[PDB]
């Protein structure tokens, strides 16, 4: 576990901060001296995150499928802490259906919340970062956005779109002092994926053994948070437009 | 590929037209689908050899279903699909509007998916088939201005992988073609917003590619010569991303 | 199966043309109207390939670990057919050992034959191609050169080096009219890999079932030859410095 | 990382020196290995805090074995390894000689492998460890002139994957760092053969990177914060390959 003094007094917005990776990201950032706006679709969970964290952190409710609500989030961060230095777009949904059974309604929702949402956070965060002299962004994608996982079509399509979001953000805002990188976790112990791992094949492992074989073990959300906080830090001054693979080796070999 | 039935979306102009003509030269029955019915008819007419024309708005699932059915009615079934329908949009990430984002995704990514969603069951009925989704180098490397476009093209790259994955056991293959700079009306309009176009092309890619050059790759990807190629991202960029030029 | 009239009367050198992918490449090229020099470490196998093929094709012996022998190969192709338009570097060895047990002697041999060999073929082929107004090259690598396969360290290191060979060849010779691309087959029915698949784990599939799960089925060498001949053709005019994955989907998903 | 033991090859100058100093700031015992013994001593002396110096020619397996043993003797064992030793060579693909190719491979690729070969058993004896192999953007994207160099750097990228694969169950992680343009003597000499250096750097990467900036990534990759990062190729190129610049 490493420290970053460049993060003391910085302001960060974390979306999906109510549970899992986002709650883990919010708490780690607070411990680095950040002012954190914990945003979530579930208003109570957001309040509860800020309550767990302390460190003067604040909460707000955001449905990242609505642009106006994203604008109101950034406004609230500015009004609570004076500006915006860091962004972690982590809000998202998982959806499971074969590619040929997925409905348009489901696809639209998954693209709106995941892809359109991550973009809109960058669209309204970045202007405020430019005023501060630069900033850092991490969008959470998934291994399913670069490698196929059966049943994750819509989801995977949205998560691929996020991987490219970071590149185009890096390209367009590097001369404004802004960095953007994508984090690709594989299998993490969080409520969001617990819905997903209900997927049980004709074999009794297949989640438990699937995950052990591919990744070695289940990942703790805390292990993704240390990566996110590194990527937001000045130790990552030379890292922009990259896909950070944090999959415990999953795609490094034939397992 | 003689005797095979192919649907090509955006067949009215550009790569789609070169792809349709080229599949026709290979003995293939071709349904030319386009949002412009006159371009569709004009293409089918230009090609001549059995090709049918069809008007499709790939933002509308119902019309995509009708297009596949039209191809079954005209030709018996469906063996090959080339999803080339698309739109370009230019605007910075921060100046892009929700409406333009939604429309670019709807047409490019959703449309490409829906085309596979409904063509694939017909390929299953035939014992298998092959899909080539047309994306862009801009779906993998950021070109400034091309946010919503690029994001949608990136998602198509992933469409092909998930398709290949779930449908391999049904004998269906899917790959993405990533052209860079090709002489087409869709692009020429785009590129006309000018390290500017002319010299970038010469330097990265060597010269502008013809739509025909792309067509011969599509056809290769659709053929039994590509029988062990599936879920891949095919780069036809003249070296652009291979080197620091 | 598709045709290419642009290949009639073209001259191709195929190394490792005695068996497997190379024999398959040589025979397909002959059927496209190519003059083929079938080169192999095993002189008899080379003669026998040219004998199977007919079509005026010729044979020569080459140990691609020796530069002089590579020079003599190109000389013989020039003397037999007048020049050199196409190259397929396919000569190679497989070696199996854990990364920590591999000897220097074994590493050196595997790098010399695979990596140094493919390079040297390009070094002495390319000048002759430049005289003809351009040309095409395919180097055979392996999925093991981009993804880890346990026991293939040296081999995999050499095969990665080949993937980059193509990029640097494309870069340096594009303005001379020369294209270079790498083919990455996974699991093919050839004698070269049959040594490899003797690798049997604590489970009875593990080759048979390993290969079915990952790739769907065993690949026929003929299926790699159609890809090589495409890549050498003018239908690939816009393809240079790429890694052609012909793995039947192996790395497209979590299998 | 306090209390951990690290071997850094090529610690005498450049990224290696920044890596050694930076691990020292983190409470880590460091063996500074370099082909130049004076640079090794000078580095260990500059750092001061327990660091030992060691002369190594990574083309020679026997000296690599002695280096690991020296680190065990000095500090008890080995937890971390940073293989940064290397040489640059410039020559076109067709003008490169077998001798220069052999030497570049020997030092860069073989040397990096041998360092892992012998350090890893010591990491196993400790319950695990972490490796960072230093490669180059030139190992993935072709820079003209850099053939043998690039080929060797590409192989290192694969070293890290096979290492991660076979050694994950022993608690060992391995990753590659791919810097682009960093202000170091090794590079400055290289880059001095001048779309030329100054402007390419500004355009692709934004500015030249400091060796320190690279060091902080190495340290991150060696830390328990990177506990779910293994077999990866870490890109620290300031955006170079993310966009068409």
Short mmCIF file of C-alpha atoms in Angstrom, two decimals, chain A residues 1-4 28 164 167-168 170-172 174 186-187 212-220 223-224 226-227 230-231 234-253 255, chain D residues 1 22 26 158 161-162 164-166 168 181 201-210 213-214 216-217 219-221 223-243 245:
data_model
loop_
_atom_site.label_atom_id
_atom_site.label_comp_id
_atom_site.label_asym_id
_atom_site.label_seq_id
_atom_site.Cartn_x
_atom_site.Cartn_y
_atom_site.Cartn_z
CA UNK A 1 0.00 0.00 0.00
CA UNK A 2 1.55 3.32 -1.23
CA UNK A 3 0.91 6.98 -0.56
CA UNK A 4 0.45 10.07 -2.76
CA UNK A 28 -9.10 5.11 -0.65
CA UNK A 164 -12.29 4.25 -26.77
CA UNK A 167 -8.43 7.43 -25.96
CA UNK A 168 -10.45 10.27 -27.48
CA UNK A 170 -6.69 11.74 -23.87
CA UNK A 171 -6.30 12.95 -27.46
CA UNK A 172 -8.59 15.97 -27.19
CA UNK A 174 -3.91 16.37 -23.29
CA UNK A 186 -12.18 -9.05 -14.54
CA UNK A 187 -13.73 -10.81 -11.51
CA UNK A 212 -9.87 -19.71 -10.01
CA UNK A 213 -8.67 -21.18 -13.32
CA UNK A 214 -8.62 -17.89 -15.22
CA UNK A 215 -7.72 -15.31 -12.58
CA UNK A 216 -6.27 -17.42 -9.73
CA UNK A 217 -8.64 -16.02 -7.09
CA UNK A 218 -11.53 -13.63 -6.55
CA UNK A 219 -10.38 -9.97 -6.53
CA UNK A 220 -11.26 -7.66 -3.66
CA UNK A 223 -7.42 -4.12 -5.09
CA UNK A 224 -9.08 -2.14 -7.91
CA UNK A 226 -5.37 1.15 -5.39
CA UNK A 227 -5.05 0.98 -9.16
CA UNK A 230 -2.48 5.37 -8.74
CA UNK A 231 -3.90 6.27 -12.20
CA UNK A 234 1.03 12.25 -10.57
CA UNK A 235 3.00 8.99 -10.56
CA UNK A 236 0.88 8.37 -13.69
CA UNK A 237 1.93 11.68 -15.30
CA UNK A 238 3.02 9.78 -18.39
CA UNK A 239 -0.02 7.46 -18.55
CA UNK A 240 -2.89 8.54 -20.80
CA UNK A 241 -5.19 6.75 -23.28
CA UNK A 242 -4.22 3.32 -21.98
CA UNK A 243 -6.23 0.23 -21.11
CA UNK A 244 -5.16 -0.89 -17.67
CA UNK A 245 -5.63 -4.66 -17.42
CA UNK A 246 -6.14 -5.71 -13.76
CA UNK A 247 -7.34 -9.22 -14.49
CA UNK A 248 -4.80 -11.16 -12.45
CA UNK A 249 -3.32 -12.62 -15.67
CA UNK A 250 -6.61 -13.90 -17.13
CA UNK A 251 -5.79 -12.85 -20.74
CA UNK A 252 -1.99 -13.20 -20.48
CA UNK A 253 -2.19 -16.99 -21.10
CA UNK A 255 -5.55 -21.27 -18.96
CA UNK D 1 7.68 -1.78 0.31
CA UNK D 22 12.96 5.46 -5.69
CA UNK D 26 10.33 3.37 -0.16
CA UNK D 158 6.34 -11.95 -24.09
CA UNK D 161 3.47 -13.06 -20.00
CA UNK D 162 5.06 -16.50 -19.82
CA UNK D 164 3.24 -14.50 -15.07
CA UNK D 165 1.68 -17.66 -16.40
CA UNK D 166 4.03 -20.28 -14.99
CA UNK D 168 1.41 -17.06 -10.72
CA UNK D 181 10.89 8.94 -25.02
CA UNK D 201 8.53 13.87 -29.23
CA UNK D 202 6.46 17.01 -28.75
CA UNK D 203 3.79 15.78 -31.13
CA UNK D 204 3.45 12.12 -30.13
CA UNK D 205 4.16 12.31 -26.41
CA UNK D 206 3.63 15.99 -25.41
CA UNK D 207 7.10 16.40 -23.95
CA UNK D 208 10.10 14.25 -23.01
CA UNK D 209 9.52 12.09 -19.93
CA UNK D 210 11.92 12.18 -16.95
CA UNK D 213 8.35 9.53 -13.92
CA UNK D 214 9.11 6.02 -15.20
CA UNK D 216 7.16 5.75 -10.00
CA UNK D 217 5.37 3.37 -12.35
CA UNK D 219 7.56 1.03 -8.05
CA UNK D 220 3.73 0.89 -8.44
CA UNK D 221 4.07 -2.29 -10.51
CA UNK D 223 3.89 -2.93 -5.01
CA UNK D 224 0.91 -4.80 -3.46
CA UNK D 225 -1.28 -2.06 -4.98
CA UNK D 226 -0.57 -3.92 -8.28
CA UNK D 227 -1.54 -7.28 -6.74
CA UNK D 228 -4.10 -7.96 -9.50
CA UNK D 229 -1.77 -6.73 -12.27
CA UNK D 230 0.32 -9.45 -13.88
CA UNK D 231 1.33 -10.42 -17.41
CA UNK D 232 0.46 -6.90 -18.59
CA UNK D 233 2.26 -4.50 -20.93
CA UNK D 234 2.27 -1.14 -19.17
CA UNK D 235 2.24 1.82 -21.61
CA UNK D 236 3.84 5.02 -20.34
CA UNK D 237 4.03 6.89 -23.66
CA UNK D 238 2.09 10.09 -22.90
CA UNK D 239 -0.60 9.09 -25.40
CA UNK D 240 1.65 8.29 -28.37
CA UNK D 241 -0.22 5.21 -29.57
CA UNK D 242 -3.63 6.24 -28.22
CA UNK D 243 -4.23 8.78 -31.02
CA UNK D 245 -1.36 12.97 -33.49
#
